[PDB]
Amino acid sequence: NKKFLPFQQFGRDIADTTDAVRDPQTLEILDITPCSFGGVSVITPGTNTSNQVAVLYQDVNCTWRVYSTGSNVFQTRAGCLIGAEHVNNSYECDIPIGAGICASYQTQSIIAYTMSLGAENSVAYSNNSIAIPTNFTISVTTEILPVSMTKTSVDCTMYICGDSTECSNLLLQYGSFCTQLNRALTGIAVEQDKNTQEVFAQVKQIYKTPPIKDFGGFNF
Amino acid sequence: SVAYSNNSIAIPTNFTISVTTEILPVSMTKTSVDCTMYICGDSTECSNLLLQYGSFCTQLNRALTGIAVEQDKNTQEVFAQVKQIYKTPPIKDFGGFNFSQILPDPSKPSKRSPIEDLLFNKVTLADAGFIKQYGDCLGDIAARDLICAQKFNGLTVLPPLLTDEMIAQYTSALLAGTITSGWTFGAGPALQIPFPMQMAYRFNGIGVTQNVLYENQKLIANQFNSAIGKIQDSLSSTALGKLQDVVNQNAQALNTLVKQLSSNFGAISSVLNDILSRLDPPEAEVQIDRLITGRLQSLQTYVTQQLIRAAEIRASANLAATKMSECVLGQSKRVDFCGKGYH
Amino acid sequence: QMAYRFNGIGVTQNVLYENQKLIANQFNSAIGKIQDSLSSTALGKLQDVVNQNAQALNTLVKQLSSNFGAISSVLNDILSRLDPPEAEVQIDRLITGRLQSLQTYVTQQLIRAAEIRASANLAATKMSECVLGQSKRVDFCGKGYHLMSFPQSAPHGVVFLHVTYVPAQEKNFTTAPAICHDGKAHFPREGVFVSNGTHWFVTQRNFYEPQIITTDNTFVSGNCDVVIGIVNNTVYDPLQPELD
Ligand SMILES: *[C@@H]1O[C@H](CO)[C@@H](O[C@@H]2O[C@H](CO)[C@@H](O)[C@H](O)[C@H]2NC(C)=O)[C@H](O)[C@H]1NC(C)=O
Ligand SMILES: *[C@@H]1O[C@H](CO)[C@@H](O[C@@H]2O[C@H](CO)[C@@H](O)[C@H](O)[C@H]2NC(C)=O)[C@H](O)[C@H]1NC(C)=O
Ligand SMILES: *[C@@H]1O[C@H](CO)[C@@H](O[C@@H]2O[C@H](CO)[C@@H](O)[C@H](O)[C@H]2NC(C)=O)[C@H](O)[C@H]1NC(C)=O
Ligand SMILES: *[C@@H]1O[C@H](CO)[C@@H](O[C@@H]2O[C@H](CO)[C@@H](O)[C@H](O)[C@H]2NC(C)=O)[C@H](O)[C@H]1NC(C)=O
Ligand SMILES: *[C@@H]1O[C@H](CO)[C@@H](O[C@@H]2O[C@H](CO)[C@@H](O)[C@H](O)[C@H]2NC(C)=O)[C@H](O)[C@H]1NC(C)=O
Ligand SMILES: *[C@@H]1O[C@H](CO)[C@@H](O[C@@H]2O[C@H](CO)[C@@H](O)[C@H](O)[C@H]2NC(C)=O)[C@H](O)[C@H]1NC(C)=O
Ligand SMILES: *[C@@H]1O[C@H](CO)[C@@H](O[C@@H]2O[C@H](CO)[C@@H](O)[C@H](O)[C@H]2NC(C)=O)[C@H](O)[C@H]1NC(C)=O
Ligand SMILES: *[C@@H]1O[C@H](CO)[C@@H](O[C@@H]2O[C@H](CO)[C@@H](O)[C@H](O)[C@H]2NC(C)=O)[C@H](O)[C@H]1NC(C)=O
Ligand SMILES: *[C@@H]1O[C@H](CO)[C@@H](O)[C@H](O)[C@H]1NC(C)=O
Ligand SMILES: *[C@@H]1O[C@H](CO)[C@@H](O)[C@H](O)[C@H]1NC(C)=O
Ligand SMILES: *[C@@H]1O[C@H](CO)[C@@H](O)[C@H](O)[C@H]1NC(C)=O
Ligand SMILES: *[C@@H]1O[C@H](CO)[C@@H](O)[C@H](O)[C@H]1NC(C)=O
C-alpha cells in the first residue's frame, strides 16, 4: 500500500535493508519480507539413554512451519511442542520447557506436564485454638558457598606471537593493552587471597581441642 | 533542635501503625541471539565466511543461556521459600483486621488481589504473549512493529518458566501462612494461632507489652485498615519506576542492536546484498569481513552489558529473598530493614 | 553452651537439662546421616568454578585457529611465502583478533570474580554470625531456629553444618488472650494461656510445658470489660498456704 513518488525506486527501513521495491515493468510496489522466522529448541533426555527428541517451535500456533508433523502435537504458551505426549498429572520440573510446562522421560516416551508447586495444605484457623509442639527434632543441613576462583596469568607475547620475532616487534603498538590485562588479572589474583583470608582468618589464635573428649554425649 | 537536659525524658503516649511500600526488581527478560541471522541473514557467502568465529558465537550463546537460567533461579529463590500452598479459611474473622486488599479475589479470571491487579495494570510490558506468528506480521507490518523487526534479525525473547498465575499462587500461600500461623511456618510445621495473639506477640517483639494491643484492639484494627486503604490510594494515584526501568532498558538494548545494523564499519555499504551485487567474491570478502567484525563486536558489547545488568539484578533478587525470609517469615530487629520504625 | 543456645531461641534450659541424652543421640544421628547423605550423593556449586575456569582457558587456547580475516591462522605459514610488506597486514589482523579474544576473557574473568567476591563476603558474614555466635535472622543459618554452625574446608569453597531446631508433634488446645479473676485482667508473662479441656494453664510457645496460673506467671492490667476474648479462671496466689 506504500505510494512511491515518481522519482523513487527502492525503500529502506531503519536498518538500511531494502523493504519495498517497484517492479520496473508493471509499476506496482511490492514489499520484501525475510523467509526465516521463529525459534527452535530441542529437548533431549541424554544420548546415553535414548535418541528420541522433542522439538519446541516458539512461533507456531497449532490449533505449518514445522520440519515434520509426526504425532503428539501439543500447544503451550511457549509454542508448539511436537514429539511429546501430554499428561494430566503434576510432578516436579525436570526439563524446563517454559510458561509453566516441563518435560521428562517417563513411561518409553517423552512427556510434558504442568509443574506442581507443592502439596496443597490448609491450616484450621479458629478464634480460640492454638497449636503448641510437644517434641522437637535437631536437624543438620549443608550450605555450600564458593569462596575463591583459580588465579591466572597471561603472556601476550607468547599467546599472540609465540617465538615469532617479527610478530613480537609488530606487537609494540599494543603494550598498554597487555599492561591493563595483567593489572586486572593481578587484581583478581590478590582479591582471591584476600577473600580466603577474610573468610577463614577471623581469629588469630589457634585453639586446640584437648584429649578429654567428654562433651556430655556429643561426639565431634 | 532537641532540648537536651540531664534530668528530662520524652515518653510517647500514642502511636501510629503505618504501612509503606518497597519495590525490588527480581528478574529481567531472557533473550537469545542467532549469530548467522543477525550478522549475515540469508547470505550464504556471509554464512560461509562466518565459520571463522564459531567459538565466539558459542560463547555469546553460553553467556545468554546462563543469564536465562539465572533469572529463573532468582524467581524460584525469592518466591519458592515454602513448598506448601496454604489456603485461607472461609472464616474471615481476623479480629477486626481486613485483608480483602491483599487476599485473592475469586471474581477475576486470575486469582490476584486488588492491589496486585493495580500493580499489574501500571507496568507496561513489550510482549503481550510470546507467540508472534509469521503470518501475523507479513508485509508492511514488518519494520513497523519493533518485536517483529527484532525477530527478523534473530533477537528472541524467551518466556519465564514460572507464570504470573503461579507467582500469584506462591504469594497467596505465603500470605495465608503468615495470617494463619505467624512466623512458625518458616521454621517447621505450621502451628495455628489467632491473628490478635500473633500481633500481640509481635508487639512484644518491639518492646511494648501485649496488654496495650489487647486493650486498643479496635483502634489498632481501624488504623491498620485505614493504612491499607491509604496505600491502595497512593499506589493508584502515583510509581513503579524501578520495575519499568528494567523493561525499558531491555527494550532499548534490543532496539539499539537492531539499529546498529546501519553502520558501515568502514565498508562501501552497510547491506550485504549491495556488497555482493556489483562486487566479485575475492574483493567483496574484505567488506563482508569488515561488517562481520563490526557486528560481532556489537554483539559482544550487548552481551557484556547484559551480564553486568544481570549481576545487578542478582544483587537485587538476593536482597529481596533475604527481606522476604526475615520480614515476612518472621520479625526483624534490624533498624530500617523492613520499613521506617519498629517492624 | 547448649542450654544457653536453647535459651536463645525461646526454649528454657530445663528442657535440655532433662532431655540431654535424647538431644545428644539426635545430634550424633544427624551427623551420621549427613555423613551418608554426602557419601552417597553433590558439590556442584564448587565443581562449577573449576569447570568454568578450565573451559575458559581451553576455549582461549582453541581460539588460536581463527583466521580473523587472514589467509591463514599460523604465523609460520604467513611469514613463509609472504614478504614483510604484505605479511604485516595478515599479522596485524591476527594480532587484533587475539587481542580481542584476550580482552573478552579478561572481562568474563572480572565479572566472575565480582560474583565470587559477593559469595565470599556472604560466606564471611555467615561465618561471623552463625559460627562465632547465634543468629536470630530467619533462614540465615538454615531452616528453623538456629543453634550453631560448623565450618568445613572444601576445594575453592566453604561448607557449613547448620544445627537447627525444628518443632514436631503438635497438639490441639483451646486458648484465650487474658484471664480475669477478681475484676482484673491477667496476661501471661512469658507464655500463652492453654487448656486441655477442663483446666487452664500457661505454657511456653515452642514447647508444651503446662504450669498453674499464679501471681508470678501473670501480671495485671485493667478490668474484665476492655479485652474481647477473656475467660474466667482462678489465679492461685502462693501466699495463702504460706500463711495457713
Ligand atoms: C493459538 O491460537 C488460538 C486461536 O487460533 C488461541 O485461542 C484463542 O485464545 C483467545 C485468548 O483470549 C481466546 O479469546 C479465544 O477464544 C481462543 N480461541 C479458541 C478457538 O480457543 C490461542 O490462545 C493461541 N495460543 C496462544 C498460546 O496464545
Ligand atoms: C485442631 O482441631 C481442628 C478441628 O477442630 C482441626 O481442623 C480440622 O482438621 C481436619 C483433619 O482431618 C480437617 O478435615 C478439617 O477440615 C479441619 N477443620 C476444622 C474442622 O477445624 C485441626 O487440624 C486441629 N489441629 C491440628 C494441628 O491438627
Ligand atoms: C520425642 O521424640 C523422640 C524421638 O523422635 C522420642 O524418643 C523415642 O521414644 C520411643 C518410645 O519409647 C523409643 O522407642 C525410641 O527409641 C526413642 N528414640 C530415641 C532416639 O531415643 C520421644 O519419646 C519423644 N517424646 C515425646 C514426649 O513424645
Ligand atoms: C562417638 O560417636 C561416633 C559415631 O560415629 C563413634 O565413632 C564410630 O561409631 C560407629 C557406630 O557406632 C562404631 O561402630 C565405631 O566403632 C566408632 N568408632 C570407633 C573408633 O570406635 C565414636 O567412637 C564415639 N566416640 C566415643 C568416645 O564414644
Ligand atoms: C473489608 O473491606 C472491604 C472493602 O475494602 C469490604 O467490602 C465492602 O463492604 C461494604 C460494607 O458491607 C459494602 O458496602 C461493599 O459493597 C463491599 N465491597 C467492597 C467495596 O469491597 C469488606 O466488607 C470488609 N470486610 C468485612 C469483614 O467487612
Ligand atoms: C491516639 O491516636 C488515635 C488516632 O491517631 C486517636 O483516635 C482518634 O480519636 C479521635 C477522637 O476521639 C477520633 O475522631 C478518631 O476517629 C480516632 N482515630 C481512629 C483511627 O479511630 C486516639 O484518641 C489517640 N489517643 C490519645 C490518648 O491521644
Ligand atoms: C487436664 O489437666 C488437669 C491437670 O490438673 C487434669 O486434672 C487432674 O487430673 C489428674 C489425673 O489426670 C488428677 O489426679 C487430678 O486430681 C486432676 N486435678 C488436678 C487439680 O490436678 C485433668 O484431668 C486433665 N483433663 C483431661 C481431659 O485430660
Ligand atoms: C466471669 O466472671 C465475672 C465475675 O466473676 C462475671 O461477671 C458477672 O456479670 C453479671 C452481669 O454482667 C453480674 O450480674 C454478676 O454479678 C457478675 N459476677 C459477679 C461474681 O459479680 C461474668 O459473667 C463471668 N463470665 C462468664 C462468661 O461466665
Ligand atoms: C551414560 O552412558 C555412558 C556410556 O554409555 C555410561 O558409562 C554412563 O554410566 C551412563 N550414565 C548413567 C547415569 O547411566
Ligand atoms: C485431561 O483432563 C481434561 C479435562 O478437560 C480432559 O479433557 C482430557 O481428556 C484429560 N486427558 C488428557 C491427558 O488430556
Ligand atoms: C471469635 O468469635 C467469637 C464469637 O463470634 C468472639 O467472641 C471472639 O472474640 C472471636 N475471636 C477473636 C480472636 O476475636
Ligand atoms: C563432667 O563430669 C561430671 C562428673 O564427673 C558430670 O556430672 C558432668 O556431666 C560431666 N560433663 C559433661 C559435659 O558431661
Q: How distant is the Cα of B185 from the closest Cα of chain A, in angstroms?
A: 10
DSSP assignment string, A171-195: GGGGHHHHHHHHHHHHHHHHHHHHH
Does C144 sit within 8 Å of B52, measured CB to CB?
A: no
How many Cα atoms within 13 Å fall on the side-chain side of residue B69?
7
| Cβ contact B140:A25 at 8 Å | no
What is the rounded CA–CA span in Å between residue C201 and residue B216?
25
H or E element at residue A12: strand A10-12
DSSP, res B216: S
What is the rounded CA–CA span in Å between residue A97 and residue A86?
13
| Cβ contact C170:A131 at 8 Å | yes
User: Is the Cβ atom of B219 under 6 angstroms away from ligand 6?
Assistant: yes
Residue A211 CB neighbour total at 10 angstroms: 5
| Cβ contact B43:B266 at 8 Å | no
What is the rounded CA–CA span in Å between residue B250 and residue B306?
9
How many Cα atoms within 13 Å fall on the side-chain side of residue A35?
2
H or E element at residue A133: strand A129-146
Q: How many residues does chain B have?
A: 343
Residue C206, C-alpha cell as written in the block: 515452642
The residue among B101, B157, B118 whose CA lies nearest residue B240 is B118
User: Is the Cβ atom of C170 under 6 angstroms away from ligand 2?
Assistant: yes
End-to-end alpha carbon distance in chain B: 27
For residue C132, give every residue at least 6 positions away whose Cβ sits within 8 Å of its Cβ, in sequence order, or none. A202
State the residue for C-alpha cell 515452642: C206
| Cβ contact B147:B258 at 8 Å | no
What is the rounded CA–CA span in Å between residue C100 and residue C26?
58
The residue among B333, B343, B319, B332 whose CA lies nearest residue B26 is B319
Integer Rg of chain C from CA: 34
Alpha-carbon distance values, B212 to B126, B202, B207, C208 (Å): 50, 12, 11, 26
User: What is the arrangement of strands in the sheet containing A79-82, beginning at the earlier edge strand?
Assistant: A40-43, A54-57, A79-82, A73-76
| Cβ contact A94:A86 at 8 Å | no
End-to-end alpha carbon distance in chain C: 42
Question: Experimentally, how was this structure solved?
Answer: cryo-EM
The Å distance, Cα B206 to ligand 6 centre, comes to: 22
Q: Which ranges in B205-280 belong to alpha helices (H)?
A: 210-215, 217-237, 241-259, 272-276
What is the rounded CA–CA span in Å between residue A164 and residue B142?
52
The residue among B311, C200, C205 whose CA lies nearest residue A132 is C205
CA angle, corner A179, sides to A173 and A183, nearest 5?
Answer: 165
State the residue for C-alpha cell 573478552: C104
User: Is the Cβ atom of C152 under 6 angstroms away from ligand 2?
Assistant: no
| Cβ contact C145:A139 at 8 Å | no
What is the rounded CA–CA span in Å between residue B38 and residue B261?
9
What angle do the packed helices B241-259 and B281-323 form, to 10 degrees? 170
Residue B78 is which amino acid? V
What is the rounded CA–CA span in Å between residue C49 and residue C59?
15
User: Is the Cβ atom of B232 under 6 angstroms away from ligand 5?
Assistant: no
State the residue for C-alpha cell 501485649: B210
- Burial (CB count <10 Å: 0-12, 13-18, 19+), residue B53: buried
H or E element at residue A19: strand A18-22
The ligand 10 atom nearest the CA atom of A88: 13
Alpha-carbon distance values, C92 to A168, A212, C87, C96, C107 (Å): 11, 71, 9, 6, 22
What is the rounded CA–CA span in Å between residue C145 and residue C138?
8
Please list every residue in chain A whose beta carbon sits closer than 8 Å to the beta carbon of residue B258: 14-15
What is the rounded CA–CA span in Å between residue B206 and residue B196?
16
User: Is the Cβ atom of A24 under 6 angstroms away from ligand 12?
Assistant: no
What angle do the packed helices C84-126 and B54-79 form, to 10 degrees? 10
Residue A136 φ then ψ, to 5°? -155, 165
Alpha-carbon distance values, C10 to C146, C191, C203, C204, C207 (Å): 11, 10, 12, 8, 9
Q: Calculate the CA dihedral of residues C92, C98, C101, C102 and round it to 10 degrees.
A: -110
| Cβ contact B228:B19 at 8 Å | yes
Please list every residue in chain B whose beta carbon sits closer than 8 Å to the beta carbon of residue A39: 32, 156, 158
What is the rounded CA–CA span in Å between residue C97 and residue B26?
37
Q: Calculate the CA dihedral of residues B189, B169, B199, C229 and round it to 10 degrees.
A: -80
Closest residue on chain C to B192 (Cα): C172
What is the rounded CA–CA span in Å between residue B328 and residue B174?
8
End-to-end alpha carbon distance in chain A: 82
For residue B111, give every residue at least 6 positions away whose Cβ sits within 8 Å of its Cβ, in sequence order, or none. B104, B105, B165, B168, B169, B172
What is the rounded CA–CA span in Å between residue B256 and residue B250?
10
Q: How many residues does chain A have?
A: 220
Strands (E), chain B: 30-33, 84-87, 155-158
For residue C225, give every residue at least 6 positions away whose Cβ sits within 8 Å of its Cβ, in sequence order, or none. none
Q: Which chains share 3+ C-beta pairs under 8 angstroms with B?
A: A, C
Alpha-carbon distance values, A107 to A55, A85, A87 (Å): 19, 10, 11
Q: Using H for helix, E for strand and C for coil, what is the string for C129-194?
A: HHHCCCCCCCCCCCCCEEEEEEEEEECCEEEEEEEEEEEEEEEEEEECCCEECCCCEEEECCCEEE
Does B140 sit within 8 Å of A31, measured CB to CB?
A: yes
Q: Using H for helix, E for strand and C for coil, what is the string for chain C?
A: CHHHHHHHCCCCHHHHHHHHHHHHHHHHHHHHHHHHHHHHCCCHHHHHHHHHHHHHHHHHHHHHHCCCCCCCCCHHHHHCCCCHHHHHHHHHHHHHHHHHHHHHHHHHHHHHHHHHHHHHHHHHHHHHHHHCCCCCCCCCCCCCEEEEEEEEEECCEEEEEEEEEEEEEEEEEEECCCEECCCCEEEECCCEEEECCCCEEEECCCCCCCECCECCCEEECCCCCCCCCCEECCCECCCHHHHC
Please list every residue in chain C whose beta carbon sits closer than 8 Å to the beta carbon of residue B293: 69
State the residue for C-alpha cell 578429654: A212
